């Protein structure tokens, strides 16, 4: 009645008992599995809040204490008087860490307890929101010694619109639809680029132009804010032994900072709560640079390497991709900017799974996102069966505000 | 009807074929178990009725005289005897369908070209061995490999089953040690000790071809030495790394799966070995580089003078690409059919487009379709897939012992 899970490299078997507590429902049925798809009232607020309060008082060894029951009654009474409730500062910190811990697609969760939580729930305007965001970027970047962080802006509440960051990440390169239909820059960012221009941004014409932030205060149009260039640390890409690689003029930014996800804690929703960590090298080298629908550099690099691109069996794509990933790792290490390779990251994720089996009886994990996009079966997570399910607190997708 | 998106091109399709999914799978709204290798009497007539309907739809003759006639016959056969017999053409159709329905098979663009050997009159283990031998010779074909399946007698109540105890027709010995380790293939330590147990004189090499354990109903298995010239093997060499040949690596030509159960129209065939040709990553990445298999990756990296002291040199990735190159070069030089993972996945994308217009979708298991190296460099990575069970099917079954 609890899923049995095998690791095929060692022979291990565990049972994921935590999955039986899964609090919301996913896309799969006994009919059909949809695991590979990218996108899968006071009483119900109270029951969500009650579960989270139970989690919080369990974590501090105060389950069933005087303070525990008091907090339950306080929330009950605030939901009856106001239709909502406010988290205490310690509850917010706990909830943000649990949301990361619970994120099935994150291979970086060995780190979940080391998260700096900035409380911006008093934020008042898009201009104050910008200042909070700049300081998050400065703290998290830390001159290349990256530190995980999240900034939480005010929750959704009755009577008011949302705070929203329109950008999908705090640092993103412009994607300029050009008139053939090609894109100069990042094709993933064509939409937000057009929105920025529409709100008064004077565009560039380079491949690596950092976009401005579009920031929305409750019941206000979004407002455009240019990031100070010295806050955006970037890494020019070179290769340790292919000297022509630097002449590609490729770059990437230090800080991966997701800004468009919804943070849900105890039934409360925080539509603006950007979080950042540090990159895994395959995110940059394999996906961002080599996806055919992104920068798509693979064939240019292969031609430069003198590989035989006329036949698939020469494995020219694999050879070129390896050297691009080498170039990313080398360049970030040379620049003294935190980066993790996919072998170290998946090894640390295996330790996380062992930690979590002891702590909670399992760990929600999405195999297709945990296994790296190159060298899959060379990493230990390939051979680990995984159980995917939804726990709260959680980071959730939400529709684009436009 | 699940909506399914390809993220490289941005196109959308709907898998309407999923709505007819039969034997339910392991996932629930509460938890997805898509990554698990093994998913967690008048009913015979329902499965035969549906399969006969499948048959006459495919030949554009549903609701015609031969269709109604065949419906009554299976009814009368089951009423009289409790089971029924497939016509030769239906057995051919069902074998091709079970391959077409195999969600984990990336090679399904070939599903229309399958040679079916009808062995339902087999009656002894010596008979099996001659059948298996005929299959291997036909399928190998001096290196110009041809997909094939041999269908041994169906399961029936009261009697025992035909079983092949080997997981494949060609396997290498796995010899345990004075200290746990293994000379040879660790995937086959269990069946190596069974062959030795039934009288097989073991060897001392890393690539000794195991004998066959063939089991006629209610008889203990019997060893059969495979004729050495029937087992086509490929010594592994690298096109430029001259020392690679000195590693003494070899693999065999024919991937022939001999432990799966073939289910057609409610009938069960526990002995129905099928074969095709290898995708290069199966040999170079999984069989040779998996930690619990031959685990050669670090030895190749030492010969390449790579820095094995830091994971961020990507020495594993570099060594693995060169192993896969050596596999492709060696099989092409030996004139033995093989397909690289780029070609195979591009053909699978074509297969998805064909199946979209033919049947309204295609059951596909993303984790098994995406190759074990260079995943996001292939188009299947960016293709959302829906996994579900149709019949006819190849199913897993308990090991016979
Ligand atoms: C500290 C280093 C971190 C590493 C190395 C890391 C690694 C990754 C990777 C490789 C992905 C896959 C995303 C993709 O392929 O586009 C991912 C997803 C994710 N990460 Fe982490 N991450 C880190 C920190 C964090 C932090 C600090 C948070 C939140 C506090 C977080 C939350 C998430 C979430 C919610 C996802 C899901 C993204 C989605 O569903 O699209 N991660 N992570
Ligand atoms: C002709 C070329 C073929 C290619 C290139 C090919 C390729 C593959 C690959 C790479 C797998 C992954 C399984 C694993 O790695 O464990 C697979 C699975 C499978 N193949 Fe094919 N195959 C071919 C022919 C066939 C034929 C002729 C049949 C049956 C008539 C077949 C039936 C299956 C089945 C049932 C599986 C599922 C394996 C499992 O779930 O363990 N294949 N195939
Ligand atoms: C904090 C952090 C550190 C590291 N290393 N990587 C990441 C992943 C980047 C990341 C990327 C995406 C894009 C996914 C699909 C869904 C919408 N988009 C088209 C969606 C995320 F939610 C996310 F988080 C985050
Ligand atoms: C005909 C054909 C051609 C090619 N190229 N590849 C194959 C796949 C080989 C193949 C391999 C396995 C091992 C999988 C795990 C599950 C049990 N075992 C430990 C299980 C199969 F069922 C199978 F078929 C077949
Ligand atoms: C269609 C498929 O689900 C999609 O490409 C997924 C697969 N696995 C992934 N894994 C990670 N880490 N990131 C991704 O964007 C994706 N994309
Ligand atoms: C744990 C995981 O599901 C398991 O290792 C699967 C993953 N995908 C696979 N894909 C193929 N083609 N063959 C395999 O054996 C596996 N193994
Ligand atoms: Cl990114
Ligand atoms: Cl194999
Ligand atoms: Gd050089
Ligand atoms: Gd040397
Ligand atoms: Zn599922």
CA distance B48 to B81: 14
**Could you tell me the distance, in angstroms and rounded to a whole number, from the CA of residue A8 to the centre of ligand 1?**
25
CA dist B371 and A112 (Å) reads 30
- Picking from B399, B169, B151, the residue whose alpha carbon sits closest to that of residue B276 is B169
The structure tokens listed for B313 are 């040199």
Distance, in Å, from the CA atom of A241 to the CA atom of A238, rounded to the nearest integer, reads 9
Report how far apart, in Å, the C-alpha atoms of A194 and of each of A187, A220, A225, B343 are. 12, 19, 15, 37
Which residues 330-369 of A have a C-beta within 8 angstroms of B?
A: 333, 341, 343-344, 347, 367-368
Tokens of A182: 């090609």
- List Cα–Cα distances, A327 to A117, A277, A336, A341, in angstroms: 33, 21, 14, 12
Q: Which letter does DSSP use for residue B287 in this model? A: I
- d(Cα A53, Cα A79) in Å, to the nearest integer? 14
Q: How was it solved?
A: X-ray
Backbone angles phi, psi at B278, to 5 degrees: -75, 145
B residues 70-109 closer than 8 Å to A (CB): none
CA distance B238 to B236: 7
Task: Tell me the CA–centroid distance for residue B372 and ligand 5, in Å.
Answer: 14
Q: Which two tokens stand for residue A399?
A: 């529709």
Q: Which of B312, B337, B382 to mutate to test the interface with A (most CBs of A within 10 A)?
A: B312
- Angle between helices A42-59 and A89-101 in degrees, nearest 10: 90
The region that residue B278 occupies, defined by phi over 0 for left and psi between -120 and 50 for alpha, beta otherwise, is beta
Question: Which of B267, B272, B269 is CA-nearest to residue B256?
Answer: B272
**Options A91, A101, A106, A356, the catalytic residue:** A106
Q: What are A5's strand-pairing partners?
A: A14
Q: Are A96 and A117 in contact (CB under 8 A)?
A: yes
Distances in whole angstroms, Cα of residue B361 to Cα of each of A29, B13, B22, B103, B395: 17, 8, 15, 12, 21
CA dist., res. A130 & res. A127, Å (int): 5
Cβ atoms within 10 A of the Cβ of A90, count?
Answer: 12
CA distances from B108 to A236, B53, B256 (A): 44, 22, 16
- For residue B296, the chain A residues in CB contact (below 8 A) are none
Tokens describing residue A284: 């940059």
Contact flag A33-B31 (C-beta cutoff 8 Å): no
How far away, in angstroms, is A169 Cα from ligand 3 center? Answer: 8
Structural contact between residues B213 and B219, judged by C-beta atoms closer than 8 angstroms? no
Q: Are B273 and B256 in contact (CB under 8 A)?
A: yes
Q: Which residue of A has its CA nearest to B1?
A: A32
CB A278 within 8 A of CB A339: yes
Q: Both tokens of residue B251?
A: 């693999």
Please tell me the distance from the alpha carbon of residue A300 to that of residue B149, in angstroms, as a whole number: 44
* Whether B315 is catalytic: no
Q: Please give the resolution of this entry in Å, rounded to 1 decimal.
A: 1.8
* Ligand 6 near B44 CB (within 6 A): no
Q: Is the C-beta atom of A269 inside 6 A of ligand 6?
A: no
Residues near ligand 1 (Cβ within 6 A): A 100, 103, 105-108, 111, 115, 148, 150, 275, 277-278, 280, 283, 340, 345, 369, 395
Say if B240 is an interface residue toward chain A (CB within 8 Å).
no
Question: What angle do the packed helices B315-333 and A316-335 form, to 10 degrees?
Answer: 170
Residues A284, A173: Cα–Cα separation, whole Å: 13
Burial label, B359 (beta-carbon count in 10 A; 0-12, 13-18, 19+) = middle
Is the minimum distance from the CB of A368 to ligand 5 under 6 angstroms?
Answer: yes
**DSSP helix/strand/coil, B209:** strand
Rounded to whole angstroms, the Cα distance separating A264 from A52 reads 10
Query: Which residues have CB atoms below 5 A from the ion given as ligand 11?
Result: A 28, 33, 35; B 27, 32, 34
Q: How far apart are the first and last CA of chain A?
A: 44
- Residue among B292, B317, B367 minimizing CB distance to A368: B367
Task: For ligand 3, say whether the CB of A104 is within 6 Å of any of its atoms.
Answer: no
Q: Compute the Cα dihedral for A354, A359, A361, A363 and give only its sign.
A: negative
Count CB neighbours of B64 within 10 A: 11
Q: Which of A71, A109, A164, A207 is catalytic?
A: A109
Closest Cα in chain A to B295: A378
| Rounded-to-5 percentages of helix, strand, coil across chain A | 40, 15, 45
B37 reaches A (C-beta below 8 A): yes
**d(C-alpha A46, C-alpha B196), whole Å:** 66
Q: Are A18 and A360 in contact (CB under 8 A)?
A: yes
Strands, E, within B127-178: which ranges?
148-151, 163-164, 174-175
* Structural domains of chain A in order of their starting residue, each with its CATH number: 16-122+148-158+262-276+346-370 (3.90.340.10), 123-147+162-233+397-401 (3.90.440.10), 234-256+279-344 (3.90.1230.10)
How far is the CA of A388 from the CAs of A190, A363, B5, B39, in angstroms? 32, 8, 21, 14
Q: What is the DSSP letter of B140?
A: H
B162-184 core/surface letters (b: 16 or more CB in 10 A; e: else): bbbbbbbbbbbbbbeeeeeebbb
Residue B26 CB neighbours (<10 A): 18
């Amino acid at each position: 009645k609890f899923p049995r899970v095998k690791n095929w490299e060692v022979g291990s078997i565990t049972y994921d008992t935590l999955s039986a507590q899964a609090q919301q429902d996913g896309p799969c049925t006994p009919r059909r599995c949809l695991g590979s798809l990218v996108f899968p009232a006071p009483e119900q607020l109270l029951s969500q809040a009650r579960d989270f309060i139970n989690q919080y008082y369990s974590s501090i060894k105060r389950s069933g204490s005087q303070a525990h029951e008091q907090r339950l009654q306080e929330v009950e009474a605030e939901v009856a008087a106001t239709g909502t409730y406010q988290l205490r500062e310690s509850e917010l910190v706990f909830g943000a860490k649990q949301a990361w811990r619970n994120a099935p697609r994150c291979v970086g969760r060995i780190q979940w307890g080391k998260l700096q939580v900035f409380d911006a729930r008093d934020c008042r305007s898009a201009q104050e929101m910008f200042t909070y965001i700049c300081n998050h970027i400065k703290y998290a970047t830390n001159r290349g010694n990256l530190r995980s962080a999240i900034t939480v802006f005010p929750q959704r509440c009755p009577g008011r619109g949302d705070f929203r960051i329109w950008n999908s990440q705090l640092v993103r390169y412009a994607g300029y639809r050009q008139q053939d239909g090609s894109v100069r820059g990042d094709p993933a960012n064509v939409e937000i680029t057009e929105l920025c221009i529409q709100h008064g941004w004077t565009p560039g014409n380079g491949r690596f132009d950092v976009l401005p932030l579009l920031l929305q205060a409750p019941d206000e149009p979004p407002e455009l804010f240019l990031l100070p260039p010295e806050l955006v640390l970037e890494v020019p890409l070179e290769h340790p032994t292919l000297e022509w690689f630097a002449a590609l003029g490729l770059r990437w930014y230090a800080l991966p900072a997701v800004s468009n996800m919804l943070l849900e804690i105890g039934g409360l929703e925080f539509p603006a709560a950007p979080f950042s960590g540090w990159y895994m090298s395959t995110e940059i080298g394999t996906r961002n640079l080599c996806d055919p629908h992104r920068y798509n550099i693979l064939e240019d690099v292969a031609v430069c390497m003198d590989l035989d691109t006329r036949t698939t069996s020469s494995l020219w794509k694999d050879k070129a991709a390896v050297e691009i990933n080498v170039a990313v790792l080398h360049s970030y290490q040379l620049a003294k900017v935190t980066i993790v390779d996919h072998h170290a990251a998946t090894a640390s994720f295996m330790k996380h799974l062992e930690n979590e089996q002891k702590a909670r009886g399992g760990c929600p994990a999405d195999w297709a996102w945990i296994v790296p996009p190159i060298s899959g079966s060379l990493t230990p997570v390939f051979h680990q069966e995984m159980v995917n399910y939804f726990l709260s607190p959680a980071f959730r997708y939400q529709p684009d505000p436009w």
